[PDB]
Amino acid sequence: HLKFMLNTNICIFTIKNKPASVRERFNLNQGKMCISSVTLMELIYGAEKSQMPERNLAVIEGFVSRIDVLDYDAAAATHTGQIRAELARQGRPVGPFDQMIAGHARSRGLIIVTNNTREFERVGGLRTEDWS
Amino acid sequence: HLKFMLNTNICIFTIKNKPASVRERFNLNQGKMCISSVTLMELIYGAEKSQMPERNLAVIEGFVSRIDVLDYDAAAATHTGQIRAELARQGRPVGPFDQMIAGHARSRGLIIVTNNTREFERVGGLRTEDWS
Numbered sequence: 075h076l077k078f079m080l081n082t083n084i085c086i087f088t089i090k091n092k093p094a095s096v097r098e099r100f101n102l103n104q105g106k107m108c109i110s111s112v113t114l115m116e117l118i119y120g121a122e123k124s125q126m127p128e129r130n131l132a133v134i135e136g137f138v139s140r141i142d143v144l145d146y147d148a149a150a151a152t153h154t155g156q157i158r159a160e161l162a163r164q165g166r167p168v169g170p171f172d173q174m175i176a177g178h179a180r181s182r183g184l185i186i187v188t189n190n191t192r193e194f195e196r197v198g199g200l201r202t203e204d205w206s
Numbered sequence: 207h208l209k210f211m212l213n214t215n216i217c218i219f220t221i222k223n224k225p226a227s228v229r230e231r232f233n234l235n236q237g238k239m240c241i242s243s244v245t246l247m248e249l250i251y252g253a254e255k256s257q258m259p260e261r262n263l264a265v266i267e268g269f270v271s272r273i274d275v276l277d278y279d280a281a282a283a284t285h286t287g288q289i290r291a292e293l294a295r296q297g298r299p300v301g302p303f304d305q306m307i308a309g310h311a312r313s314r315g316l317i318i319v320t321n322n323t324r325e326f327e328r329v330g331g332l333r334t335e336d337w338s
Binding site for chain 1: 243244246247248249250251252253254255259275277278279280282283284286287288290291292294295302303306309
């Protein structure tokens with residue numbers, strides 16, 4: 075059963091083993107984690123813009139194979155639109171991909187594991203954890 | 207068979223009947239059009255931030271019922287990440303949601319329908335049409 079949606083920075087922390095606590099908690103929870111395809115997009119971008127696209131792509135693919143990738147669907151989109159409207163009324167800036175990922179997790183009742191929790195606590199009805 | 211992925215502005219032009227030519231070309235192509243769930247997100251945002259959320263939401267739901275909403279999946283994400291790396295190297299910017307729909311359309315072999323092209327004309331291998 076899926077319990078966590080990992081943000082991009084948490085994925086990178088796991089991959090770099092820094093902070094090590096993140097990777098250790100990732101390993102603890104193998105089988106219960108997913109990422110949004112929005113996060114997959116960010117990871118692919120980091121690899122393809124790097125000096126070693128093929129190598130870094132392989133790193134991402136190996137990481138991703140240990141988790142599920144969830145399609146950003148109509149429900150995800152609908153929550154996201156609602157959240158953006160709510161954040162705007164509140165005067166609370168969240169980055170555009172972060173907003174999508176928040177909507178995606180909320181639409182699935184998942185905990186967002188991210189390290190910029192102050193910015194995600196600005197979203198209503200969302201549970202977050204920092205494993206770092 | 208799906209042939210077109212519509213951008214947000216084209217959806218709005220259709221709903222508002224302005225320009226009326228856009229709505230007419232839309233009706234013409236019913237059964238052949240879709241939007242990315244990324245575009246659905248923007249439309250829901252548009253409604254929930256308005257002064258009449260429930261009314262505008264139903265307007266969007268009614269519009270959306272006549273087309274397909276495609277989930278932003280791994281393939282869409284992958285094309286998006288690549289396009290961003292490519293556009294970055296060319297050092298010419300596209301908005302974050304625009305990049306996603308461009309990636310989504312490319313992953314599906316769809317024509318992206320828009321009102322002010324040029325911004326999508328720089329994505330390699332992407333076909334565009336202007337219905338304005």
